[PDB]
Amino acid sequence: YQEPTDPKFPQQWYLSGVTQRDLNVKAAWAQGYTGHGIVVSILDDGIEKNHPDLAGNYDPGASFDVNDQDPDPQPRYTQMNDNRHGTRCAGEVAAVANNGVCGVGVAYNARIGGVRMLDGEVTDAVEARSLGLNPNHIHIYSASWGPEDDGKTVDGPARLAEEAFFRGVSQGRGGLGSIFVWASGNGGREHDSCNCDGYTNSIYTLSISSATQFGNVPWYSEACSSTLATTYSSGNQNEKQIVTTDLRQKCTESHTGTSASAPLAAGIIALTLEANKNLTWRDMQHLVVQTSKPAHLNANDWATNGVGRKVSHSYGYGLLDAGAMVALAQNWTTVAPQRKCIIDILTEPKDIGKRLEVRKTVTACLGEPNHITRLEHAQARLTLSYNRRGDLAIHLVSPMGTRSTLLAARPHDYSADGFNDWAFMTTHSWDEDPSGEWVLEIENTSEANNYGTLTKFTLVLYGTASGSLVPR
Numbered sequence: 526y527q528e529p530t531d532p533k534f535p536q537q538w539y540l541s542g543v544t545q546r547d548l549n550v551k552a553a554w555a556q557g558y559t560g561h562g563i564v565v566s567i568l569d570d571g572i573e574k575n576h577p578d579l580a581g582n583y584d585p586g587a588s589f590d591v592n593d594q595d596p597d598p599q600p601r602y603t604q605m606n607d608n609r610h611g612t613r614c615a616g617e618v619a620a621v622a623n624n625g626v627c628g629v630g631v632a633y634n635a636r637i638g639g640v641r642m643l644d645g646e647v648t649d650a651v652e653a654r655s656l657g658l659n660p661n662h663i664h665i666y667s668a669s670w671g672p673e674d675d676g677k678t679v680d681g682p683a684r685l686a687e688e689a690f691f692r693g694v695s696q697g698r699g700g701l702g703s704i705f706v707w708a709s710g711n712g713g714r715e716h717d718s719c720n721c722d723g724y725t726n727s728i729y730t731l732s733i734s735s736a737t738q739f740g741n742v743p744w745y746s747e748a749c750s751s752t753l754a755t756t757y758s759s760g761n762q763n764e765k766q767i768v769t770t771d772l773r774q775k776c777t778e779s780h781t782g783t784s785a786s787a788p789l790a791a792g793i794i795a796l797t798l799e800a801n802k803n804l805t806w807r808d809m810q811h812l813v814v815q816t817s818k819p820a821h822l823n824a825n826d827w828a829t830n831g832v833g834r835k836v837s838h839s840y841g842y843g844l845l846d847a848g849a850m851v852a853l854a855q856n857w858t859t860v861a862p863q864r865k866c867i868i869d870i871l872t873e874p875k876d877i878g879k880r881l882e883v884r885k886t887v888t889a890c891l892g893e894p895n896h897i898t899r900l901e902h903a904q905a906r907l908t909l910s911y912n913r914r915g916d917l918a919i920h921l922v923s924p925m926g927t928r929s930t931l932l933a934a935r936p937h938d939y940s941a942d943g944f945n946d947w948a949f950m951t952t953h954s955w956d957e958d959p960s961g962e963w964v965l966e967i968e969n970t971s972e973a974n975n976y977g978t979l980t981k982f983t984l985v986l987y988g989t990a991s992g993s994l995v996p997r
């Protein structure tokens with residue numbers, strides 16, 4: 526195997542490293558996997574389809590302009606180069622290799638398109654038409670953005686966009702399901718908590734956070750229990766950043782944020798799908814859970830879950846490992862059909878006050894076709910009133926003792942609107958048996974005499990009843 530000769534490939538430290546602080550992509554390339562036959566689309570501000578490092582892999586069938594309602598996603602050029610981000614992301618996935626230009630994509634033989642959908646008013650219809658673009662041609666969608674990362678917003682897909690997610694995972698990709706890769710957010714300095722973003726908090730999105738070059742949680746990171754895994758991105762000014770294609774046929778060394786991590790993940794997922802094109806959308810999440818690596822990622826919240834995997838709210842299961850992903854994909858046995866066990870928990874509304882604990886022992890639909898002995902995602906769907914939302918912290922403890930933070934305190938969130946059946950999601954109990962006692966904790970983290978009421982708690986378990994591995 527001959528590694529790429531591109532002039533900036535040595536600067537792509539998160540691929541070309543020899544120090545073990547990389548995504549282990551060369552190992553996948555050397556196994557023969559470069560993304561041939563896979564189609565990725567970047568949902569963003571457009572794609573410079575004539576970029577010298579993108580044209581050779583550009584796919585019009587992976588592209589559309591939902592902002593202007595035409596097929597051509599070319600960015601709008603401005604003095605401030607506002608609409609460059611999709612071009613940066615596209616190159617992370619699929620910049621052409623061995624052509625003397627900039628660097629390479631993770632999946633440098635994949636086909637790459639973009640949906641121009643952020644350069645204009647983003648409505649539910651715009652979102653739905655983007656998520657649902659050509660779902661039997663596009664394999665993988667990469668989205669780096671969501672609701673405002675101001676640390677006070679709670680929002681998620683409205684009806685058309687949620688329908689696009691369910692149509693995508695159900696009928697997309699020949700019934701195997703569209704793979705939606707999402708950035709968990711850039712709201713770290715606003716103390717944002719990313720389960721309040723319904724796109725990354727979705728079970729249908731494969732959500733990705735960031736680590737800095739030296740293995741730390743970047744300033745912009747959001748912690749939450751819905752995150753699955755991590756890729757490298759930017760950090761402080763002594764740490765390197767992401768090197769990729771830029772608007773106006775240029776090359777940047779300063780692409781940054783969690784919004785730069787999701788495209789690298791999308792590229793690794795492209796290599797993995799080349800290794801086994803029959804993987805379902807859930808298979809892909811299982812592969813990420815099993816192969817991702819905590820080592821050398823620094824956080825104070827690493828915890829071992831009930832099947833012996835280390836998990837963090839900053840990093841999920843750790844750093845994506847492309848060589849391991851493609852290796853495990855090749856002989857992967859398709860997971861069983863997804864079961865869903867719905868447990869309405871409360872017999873009466875519960876005053877929150879300073880602190881509320883709700884304990885319930887469940888059988889996880891014992892005796893029914895939705896009996897789950899092997900969890901995937903779990904949700905606590907909560908309806909509650911409170912006078913100052915951001916003073917709340919919420920935790921969910923599984924029968925195996927795994928504490929998931931569903932909501933951390935958000936100091937900027939002054940809302941008095943509470944949560945209206947908000948489906949807080951955790952990945953941290955993946956592969957655990959969910960039978961037994963679950964505990965929901967709601968706490969007022971402030972000294973203020975805050976008040977409100979929990980009126981509904983639905984525990985929603987997804988998963989299967991077969992196929993478990995021996996704990997790690």
Ligand SMILES: *[C@@H]1O[C@H](CO)[C@@H](O)[C@H](O)[C@H]1NC(C)=O
Nearest residue numbers: 701802803804805858859860
């Ligand atoms: C894909 O997986 C399904 C489910 O296990 C199986 O029935 C089918 O034969 C597989 N197809 C290929 C081409 O491997």
Ligand SMILES: [Ca+2]
Nearest residue numbers: 590593595597
């Ligand atoms: Ca256009």
Ligand SMILES: [Ca+2]
Nearest residue numbers: 531621626628
């Ligand atoms: Ca190149």
Ligand SMILES: [Ca+2]
Nearest residue numbers: 674710712717
């Ligand atoms: Ca956020």
Ligand SMILES: [Cl-]
Nearest residue numbers: 691865985987
């Ligand atoms: Cl569902």
Ligand code: NA
Nearest residue numbers: 670671710711
């Ligand atoms: Na975001």
Ligand code: NA
Nearest residue numbers: 725727730732
């Ligand atoms: Na997700």
Ligand code: NA
Nearest residue numbers: 829830831926
């Ligand atoms: Na534990």
Ligand code: NA
Nearest residue numbers: 924959960961
């Ligand atoms: Na149990």
